[PDB]
């Protein structure tokens, strides 16, 4: 279950395998087996990590349907593999992968946004090793995220009653049709690395929780006492682990030696006096150093954490007992050449833009992001809502056992990967599933999602709030969204309805806010916005102008400011991003307040001024 | 019934009333009638001709619903009104107008794109006269062009099932909702002028027809003999009219004196030896001078015309007996500040761009254009399909007698205004009405449109072909389009359906072409295209890129080149133009091959090279 990010220390070394690999496209539903057994014939270069789709302009890899095959060679000194346990980790392969080393199948994985690994201790040999990775991009009614098996991509146009169209559909080239509004970027989107651990006994997992804070300071910077809990899991085979707690300067401030008991596990609690708390806008990180003891150390791992509590109380969202207000947006992992490929230069820039805007938060719309972004937000004081790739779902998916299992895998896998981050304050178990309607449909949706809500709570040792991000719907027949811990709504009054009429949009919004006012839950926007082409201007801004986007937020935000139970504003989107092509997507989704190259539109400046005057705590 | 354009000569003077008028907005359903008795209070300036909507950025006149009121003063010498018949002509007031002169209601008019006039001989007086014109912009289920009484505009977004939206709609500000894809520009869109004729007896109407051509030259530049016919109508009260035919140099080549008989008319035929024929790309104009005789001349009018025949024969469209192929586009009267206002600088530029592109034709989508444009196309050898404002129609309109009468008025009024232009080769009685479906709907549409097809044929002395421009539909249950003289189809395979997939688009197109192959009529595109933002580029062009637009025409045109019965390609659109705001309109409609400022996108250059190689005659 543990998926600790690979670390190098006195006991452990990481050997990255990123770089320019060999690559070939393959078939709609197969690829040649012999490509795992010998060097790829006539290979193309392909950089990893990165989506493959925008890395070759001679081919139209955006249109590719099915498999591709990556390959590279590598060699490491026998000295450093001798006696060690050898693990090959894929941070992400989107969506499914088969992995081979030296002509041997290592195994496969489904799930394009979470890491997986293989023990290669026995498949490795000295000299050059040949690593082959086949990656499948296909999506459909059984995948998360969901594809459409026929018809159109999400918000695509059709003339389905025209006989010629119906007939041409039967013979059209197979293409993935996302039931979600972002491009289906595929390939080795995140890092690949070989790493070592000791073989006889090793640290497999660590969970740190903030159990209780006694007497939090008025400014929330410290607490008189913090009770933290640790849970260390071991692999391999009267043994002990030493746990040292280091503060922000590396000083040892606490330490215990705990007994390992047979899963081999050690768990306990540690009191940290005068603890320095983690807050939005004021991060503070500790390190838990776990050392497996035999003066010598057998194994070690350093786990960053921050001390803070999260609690929903009535219509408030309390961080360290203080009423928080979210300011931010949904993001995407999306950029020009990389596609969905992780890029830490861009992550660093985006975090600085979050600060420039005076925002404090975002959601990982619509899939878990690369692990390095959460470390960055841990150090930079930015709060995250962590979301699984359960986007595009409807009643067709609720009746499918395979989908339900993939959904539980994604929830368990996201929380197992991300549980130690102090920046994560809430889990989202889906984006815009179908919840409303007549007959049994609302109850069917509820019966599908309630066990997943329970699973997210059971899986997280911090027991953080759980939400489900709700599409614009008939809120009077949806019986699911109102049962979440925080109500997170996506609304486009004045854009997809009441188009351009901000008076009517605000009237409609206020009618629905009157509905939520009586529910007793904290409510926030997780999306709202307007497609905007930079450089389109008007004195009376119409849809797609920079002025209309600014006016849109000015009018809507004035209405939610009147509601004390409305605890956050996350807009859509941080920045323009790529989508499947169609008649409503002008080079992708243009609801960004920043352009795809991260330049600010008029509305970004307006928002920056607004958010500069809204405090993280106590706004409401 | 005659609407001869006002002419100045020895018997007649025109006094233009264009300029900067006074203007006020008025109510949704009313205006103060006392404004006609005195100068408007606190007036704004408003230039005439021109739409009013983009002439004031302090007010939001694009949002205006209902009435506005124009006013100006004028004075003419008593010496020149004395004894004369005084006519006040509005070339176009969009959509409906009440006209007052010195407080007296002259009358009212409804069609927004055709001229109307009043006899003001008795309402004029010496010194300053006060002209007040109330103009109504409202559209709805009883107007042509059609508006929607509730819901959304054409291709608008909605979330009708959200209770807050339904409730907000009931209280939203009233707004015109076009059921057509262009902005509802209103006001005194075309010129206003006072003109004089003799009062006792005057020329009221002139119709010139090309009756027969004998021994047409191989190059169609001449015929050994041409038989033309004239029909002159007189108003007022052994009288005679002299008809002189002037060639391009002003030489009188033929001439006849005809007897006037009682409604006062003179008619006959005139033989013209070695007649020089009007052709696309090679215009030649004669002048028919009609002089009412008492040595003196009582009245005179000079009517331009061109000698050519138009005939549909099987699957060919014959001009002067040669098989013509249409190259061109739908247009709009649309430009930045003028709106739908006529602008002769822009007309002159646009005709030069038609030549630059090597096009030979356009359609007056979706309303009759300003009279000056047809005069320009007569002189520049550009063929026109002339279309009435019957756009946005469906079964709701077919049972509405007010609509039917407005539709007949527009057909009669367009042909009465435009019958003498040689450049007009075909009449269009509607754009994209509802024609298909099940039950009685296809027959209901046929029973509505067939009397209008006959009306157009009975109204035109030249008996030119009549069509109806067909929207993308289920061509197998449409029973009306296939009965037109030329089948004119609008198709967006690969844009609004099969989106982005040009292989599937061409397959679907070919399936439909196979259907039309068996119908045995000549067929042409009147629309096809793809929204394109200039400056959006890709190596594999996706929707909205310049490359996709180029590839779209390249692929579609290769398929129609294989069909001998496919006689023309008019694409959509000549240039980007304004629409009601909505989620599929990026600053309007962007299917122009030119930008709104008339600059060429990539596809315009490609089309220019294609069309350079396609002859007007004998391509198929
Ligand atoms: O339509 C939109 O702009 C947004 C609607 N909510 C879901 C987003 O993924 C999508 O991008
Ligand atoms: O959708 C479009 O782009 C066109 C479809 N046919 C009618 C045009 O007025 C309209 O502009």
| DSSP-assigned states of every residue in A81-117 | HTTEEEEEEES--BSEEEEEETTEEEEEEE-TTS-EE
Asked whether A490 lines ligand 1 (CB < 6 A), one says: yes
d(CA B320, CA B618): 12
Q: Is A371 helix (H, G, I), strand (E, B) or coil?
A: helix
Closest CA to A353 of A378, A382, A388: A382
Q: Residue A19, by phi and psi: left (phi above 0), alpha (psi -120 to 50) or beta?
A: left
Closest CA to A305 of A183, A418, A413: A418
Torsion of CA B445, B449, B451, B455, to 10 degrees: 170
d(CA B437, CA B440): 8
Sheet containing strand B222-236, edge to edge, reads B201-216, B222-236, B265-276
Which of the ligands is closest to the CA of residue A366?
1
Closest CA to B498 of B489, B490, B507: B507
d(CA A563, CA A448): 31
Tracing tokens 């006989």 back to the chain, one arrives at A163
Q: Which residues contact A119 (CB under 8 A, 6 or more apart)?
A: A85, A86, A87
Ligand 1 atom 2 nearest Cα: A181
- Find the CB nearest A168 among B492, B500, B508: B508
DSSP letter (8 states) at residue B590? -
Q: How far is B610 from chain A (nearest CA, A)?
A: 26
Q: Is B493 helix (H, G, I), strand (E, B) or coil?
A: strand
Closest CA to A339 of A8, A41, A54, A15: A54
Paired tokens of A494:
């004045």
Q: Is B597 helix (H, G, I), strand (E, B) or coil?
A: coil
Phi, psi of A160 (to 5 degrees): -70, -20
Q: Please write down the HEC assignment for all residues of B128-153.
A: CEEEEEEEECCCCCCCCCCECCCCCC
Catalytic residue selected from B291, B387, B527, B534: B527
B/e letters for B219-229, b = 16+ CB within 10 Å, e = fewer, are ebebbeebbbb
Based on the number of CB atoms within 10 Å of its own CB, is B161 exposed (0-12), middle (13-18) or buried (19 or more)? middle
Question: Which of B157, B160, B162 is best to mutate for the A interface (most A CBs within 10 A)?
Answer: B162
A78, A12 contact by CB (below 8 A): no
Closest CA to B362 of B182, B592, B175: B592
Q: Within a 10 A sphere around the Cβ of A121, how many other Cβ atoms?
A: 14
Q: Which residue of B has its CA nearest to A511?
A: B164
DSSP letter (8 states) at residue B259? E
Based on the number of CB atoms within 10 Å of its own CB, is B58 exposed (0-12), middle (13-18) or buried (19 or more)? exposed
Pocket test for ligand 2, best of B155, B181, B525 (most atoms within 8 A of CB): B181
Q: Residue A321, by phi and psi: left (phi above 0), alpha (psi -120 to 50) or beta?
A: left
d(CA A15, CA A524): 43
Q: How far is B512 from chain A (nearest CA, A)?
A: 6
- A158–B496: do the CB atoms touch at under 8 Å? yes
A465, A318 contact by CB (below 8 A): no
Quote the crossing angle between the two packed helices A546-560 and A502-517, to the nearest 10°: 30
- B173–A508: do the CB atoms touch at under 8 Å? no
Paired tokens of A605:
């400046």
Closest CA to A389 of A110, A193, A165: A110
DSSP letter (8 states) at residue A43? P
Distance between Cα A223 and ligand 1 center (Å): 41
B/e letters for A30-44, b = 16+ CB within 10 Å, e = fewer, are ebeeebbeeebeebb
| DSSP-assigned states of every residue in A331-348 | --S-BTTTBT---HHHHH
Q: Which residues contact A145 (CB under 8 A, 6 or more apart)?
A: A139, A178, A179, A180, A366, A367, A389, A390, A391, A392
CA angle A89, A95, A99 (to 5 degrees): 45
Which of the ligands is closest to the CA of residue B584?
2
Q: Please write down the HEC assignment for all residues of B298-337.
A: CEEEEEEECCCCEEEECCEEEECCEEECEEEEECCCCECC
- A163–B509: do the CB atoms touch at under 8 Å? no
Paired tokens of B495:
């844009």
| Atom nearest to B155 CA in ligand 2 | 1
Q: Residue B98, by phi and psi: left (phi above 0), alpha (psi -120 to 50) or beta?
A: beta
Q: How many residues does chain B have?
A: 620
Q: Which residues contact A535 (CB under 8 A, 6 or more apart)?
A: A546
Catalytic residue selected from A117, A432, A481, A534: A432
Ligand 1 atom 10 nearest Cα: A181
Phi, psi of B442 (to 5 degrees): -60, -40
Sheet containing strand B316-319, edge to edge, reads B310-313, B316-319, B322-323
Stated resolution in angstroms: 1.7
d(CA B192, CA B565): 44
B359, B350 contact by CB (below 8 A): no
d(CA B71, CA B133): 6
A186, A137 contact by CB (below 8 A): yes
Q: Is B291 assigned a catalytic role? A: no
Asked whether A527 lines ligand 1 (CB < 6 A), one says: yes
Q: Which residue of B has its CA nearest to A478?
A: B162
Tracing tokens 């692929």 back to the chain, one arrives at B555
- A172–B504: do the CB atoms touch at under 8 Å? yes
Tracing tokens 């009237």 back to the chain, one arrives at A507
Q: How far is A156 from chain B (nearest CA, A)?
A: 8
Alpha-carbon distances of A191 from A47, A115, A188, A475, rounded to whole Å: 11, 10, 7, 41
Helix (H) or strand (E) holding A555: helix A546-560
CA angle B223, B226, B232 (to 5 degrees): 150
B205, B2 contact by CB (below 8 A): yes
B368, B122 contact by CB (below 8 A): no
Task: Measure CA B276 to chain center.
Answer: 27
- The distance between the two most distant Cα atoms of chain B, rounded to a whole number of Å, is 81
Q: How far is B274 from chain A (nearest CA, A)?
A: 50
Phi, psi of A16 (to 5 degrees): -65, 145
Q: Please write down the HEC assignment for all residues of B527-568.
A: ECCCCECCCCCCCCCCCECHHHHHHHHHHHHHHHCCCCCEEE
d(CA B523, CA B489): 8
Q: Is B432 assigned a catalytic role? A: yes
Alpha-carbon distances of A289 from A330, A376, B439, B503, rounded to whole Å: 34, 20, 78, 60
Chain A positions in Cβ-Cβ contact with residue B159 (cut-off 8 Å): 472, 492, 496-497
Where would I find the beta strands (DSSP E) of B337-419?
361-363, 383-387
Paired tokens of B17:
């009333």
d(CA A345, CA A329): 20
Asked whether B343 lines ligand 2 (CB < 6 A), one says: no
Paired tokens of A262:
């047979």
DSSP letter (8 states) at residue A2? -
Based on the number of CB atoms within 10 Å of its own CB, is A441 exposed (0-12), middle (13-18) or buried (19 or more)? middle
- Find the CB nearest B162 among A472, A503, A542: A472
CA angle B436, B439, B441 (to 5 degrees): 45
Question: Taking the alpha carbons of B50, B55, B61, B62 in that order, is the dihedral positive or negative?
Answer: positive
d(CA B505, CA B449): 30
- B533–A531: do the CB atoms touch at under 8 Å? no
Alpha-carbon distances of A559 from A354, A505, A508, A556, rounded to whole Å: 24, 11, 11, 5
- B583–A163: do the CB atoms touch at under 8 Å? no
Alpha-carbon distances of B335 from A94, A495, B279, rounded to whole Å: 48, 26, 29
Q: Within a 10 A sphere around the Cβ of B3, how many other Cβ atoms?
A: 18
Paired tokens of A267:
């768990």
Paired tokens of B182:
């262009």
Ligand 1 atom 8 nearest Cα: A181
Number of A–B residue contacts, CB under 8 Å: 180
DSSP letter (8 states) at residue A62? G
Cis peptide before A539 (omega within 30 of 0): no
A529, A573 contact by CB (below 8 A): yes
Distance between Cα B335 and ligand 2 center (Å): 17
CA angle A556, A558, A562 (to 5 degrees): 115
Chain B positions in Cβ-Cβ contact with residue A533 (cut-off 8 Å): 533, 586-587
Q: How far is A236 from chain B (nearest CA, A)?
A: 52
Residue A19 has, within 13 A of its CA and on its CB side, a CA count of 10
Closest CA to A82 of A194, A250, A199, A2: A199
Helix (H) or strand (E) holding B498: none
- B152–A499: do the CB atoms touch at under 8 Å? yes
| DSSP-assigned states of every residue in A567-596 | EEEEES-SB-B----BTTBSSSB---SB-T
B260, B267 contact by CB (below 8 A): no
Radius of gyration of chain B (CA): 25
Radius of gyration of chain A (CA): 25
| DSSP-assigned states of every residue in A6-30 | P--BTTB-EEE--EEEEEEE--SS-
Residue range A13-197, CATH number: 2.60.120.260
| DSSP-assigned states of every residue in B103-132 | TEEEEEE--TTS-EEEE-TTT--SS-EEEE
d(CA B523, CA B486): 6
Asked whether B490 lines ligand 2 (CB < 6 A), one says: yes
User: Which segments of A395-526 does DSSP mark as H helices, in order?
Assistant: 395-398, 401-418, 441-459, 502-517
Chain B positions in Cβ-Cβ contact with residue A540 (cut-off 8 Å): 57, 60, 62-63
Q: Which residue of B has its CA nearest to A497?
A: B158
Cis peptide before B285 (omega within 30 of 0): no
| DSSP-assigned states of every residue in B473-522 | --TTT--SGGGSSSEEEE--BTTTBSTT-HHHHHHHHHHHHHHHHHH-S-
A530, A495 contact by CB (below 8 A): yes
Paired tokens of B472:
């993308």
Question: Taking the alpha carbons of B475, B481, B485, B491 in that order, is the dihedral positive or negative?
Answer: negative
Pocket test for ligand 2, best of B154, B589, B590, B596 (most atoms within 8 A of CB): B589
Q: Which residues contact A605 (CB under 8 A, 6 or more apart)?
A: none
Closest CA to B260 of B297, B295, B234: B234
Q: Which residue of A has its CA nearest to B589?
A: A583
Helix (H) or strand (E) holding A619: none
d(CA B46, CA B36): 17
d(CA B288, CA B247): 9
Cis peptide before A124 (omega within 30 of 0): no
Distance between Cα A617 and ligand 2 center (Å): 52
Q: How far is A351 from chain B (nearest CA, A)?
A: 29
d(CA B597, CA B593): 11
Distance between Cα A181 and ligand 1 center (Å): 6
Closest CA to A459 of A404, A417, A397: A417
Asked whether B181 lines ligand 2 (CB < 6 A), one says: yes
Quote the crossing angle between the two packed helices A441-459 and A401-418, to the nearest 10°: 30
A242, A221 contact by CB (below 8 A): no
d(CA B550, CA B545): 9
Paired tokens of B34:
């006392």
DSSP letter (8 states) at residue A497? B
B147, B138 contact by CB (below 8 A): yes
- Find the CB nearest B497 among A165, A498, A511: A165
B/e letters for B14-45, b = 16+ CB within 10 Å, e = fewer, are bbebbeebbbbbbeeeebeeebbeeebeebbe
- B533–A586: do the CB atoms touch at under 8 Å? yes
Task: Measure CA A479 to chain center.
Answer: 26
Closest CA to B244 of B298, B303, B198, B307: B303
Question: Which of A55, A159, A541 is best to mutate for the B interface (most B CBs within 10 A)?
Answer: A159
Q: Please write down the HEC assignment for all residues of A135-204.
A: EECCCCCCCCCCECCCCCCCCCCCCCCCHHHHHHHHHCCCCCCECCCCCCCCECCCCEEEEEEECCEEEE
Which of the ligands is closest to the CA of residue B430?
2
Pocket test for ligand 2, best of B156, B329, B432, B552 (most atoms within 8 A of CB): B432
The bridge status of strand A116-119 relative to strand A44-48 is unpaired
Phi, psi of B427 (to 5 degrees): -105, 140
Paired tokens of A362:
């975002």
Closest CA to A237 of A289, A198, A268, A194: A198
The bridge status of strand B286-292 relative to strand B299-305 is antiparallel
d(CA A307, CA A134): 41
d(CA B93, CA B272): 40
- A533–B584: do the CB atoms touch at under 8 Å? no
Q: Which residues contact A294 (CB under 8 A, 6 or more apart)?
A: none
């Amino acid at each position: 279950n543990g998926m600790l990010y690979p670390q190098s220390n006195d006991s452990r070394i990481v050997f990255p395998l990123d770089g320019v690999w060999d690559f070939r496209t393959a078939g709609e539903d197969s690829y040649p087996a012999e490509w795992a057994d010998a060097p790829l014939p006539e290979p193309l270069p392909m950089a990893v990590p990165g989506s493959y789709n925008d890395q070759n302009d001679e081919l139209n890899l955006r249109a590719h349907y099915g498999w591709v095959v990556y390959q590279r060679s590598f060699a490491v000194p026998s000295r450093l593999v001798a006696g060690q346990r050898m693990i090959l980790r894929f941070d992400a392969a989107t969506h499914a992968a088969d992995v081979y080393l030296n002509g041997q199948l290592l195994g496969s994985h489904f799930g394009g946004f979470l890491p997986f690994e293989f023990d290669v201790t026995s498949a490795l040999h000295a000299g050059e090793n040949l690593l082959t990775v086949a990656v499948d991009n296909r999506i459909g009614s059984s995948t998360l995220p969901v594809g459409n098996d026929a018809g159109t991509a999400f918000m695509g146009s059709d003339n389905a009653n025209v006989p010629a169209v119906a007939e041409a559909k039967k013979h059209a080239r197979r293409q993935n049709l996302p039931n979600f509004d972002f491009f289906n970027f595929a390939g080795l989107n995140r890092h690949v690395e070989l790493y070592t651990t000791p073989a006889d006994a090793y640290i497999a997992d660590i969970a740190i929780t903030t159990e209780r804070l006694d007497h939090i300071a008025g400014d929330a910077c410290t607490a008189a006492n913090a009770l933290i809990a640790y849970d260390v899991t071991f692999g391999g085979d009267g043994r002990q682990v030493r746990i040292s707690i280091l503060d922000g300067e590396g000083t040892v401030v606490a330490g215990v030696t705990a007994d390992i008991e047979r899963t081999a596990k050690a768990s306990g609690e540690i009191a940290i006096r005068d603890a320095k708390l983690w807050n939005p806008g004021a991060a503070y990180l500790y390190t838990a150093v776990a050392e497996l003891l035999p003066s010598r150390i057998i194994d070690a791992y350093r786990q960053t954490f921050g001390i803070r509590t999260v609690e929903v109380s009535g219509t408030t969202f309390l961080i360290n007992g203080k009423p928080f207000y979210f300011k931010g947006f949904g993001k995407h992992e999306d950029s020009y050449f990389h596609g969905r490929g992780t890029d830490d230069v861009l992550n660093v820039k985006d975090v600085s833009l979050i600060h420039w805007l005076h925002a404090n938060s975002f959601r990982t719309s619509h899939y878990p992001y690369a692990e390095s972004m959460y470390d960055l937000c841990d150090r930079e004081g930015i709060v995250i809502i962590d979301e699984v790739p359960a986007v595009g779902m409807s009643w067709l998916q609720y009746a499918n056992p395979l989908v339900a299992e993939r959904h539980r895998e994604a929830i368990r896998g996201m929380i197992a990967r991300d549980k130690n981050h102090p920046c994560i304050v809430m889990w989202s178990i889906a984006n815009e599933p179908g919840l409303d309607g007549d007959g049994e449909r609302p109850r069917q949706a509820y019966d599908y999602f309630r066990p997943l809500y329970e699973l997210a709570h059971a899986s997280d040792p911090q027991n953080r709030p759980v939400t489900l991000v709700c599409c614009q719907n008939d809120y009077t027949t949806d019986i699911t969204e109102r049962t979440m811990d925080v109500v997170c709504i996506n609304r486009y009054y004045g854009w997809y309805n009441l188009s351009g009429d901000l008076d009517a949009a605000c009237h409609a919004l206020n009618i629905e806010l009157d509905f939520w006012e009586n529910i007793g839950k904290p409510v926030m926007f997780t999306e709202y916005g307007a497609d905007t082409i930079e450089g389109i201007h008007g004195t009376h801004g119409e849809m797609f102008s920079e002025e209309f986007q600014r006016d849109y937020y000015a009018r809507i935000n004035a209405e939610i400011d009147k509601r004390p139970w409305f605890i956050g504003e996350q807009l859509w989107n941080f920045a323009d991003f790529a989508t499947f092509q169609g008649i409503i997507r002008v080079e992708g989704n243009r609801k960004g307040i920043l352009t795809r190259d991260r330049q600010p539109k008029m509305a970004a400046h307006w928002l920056r001024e607004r958010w500069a005057g809204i405090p993280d705590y106590g706004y409401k």
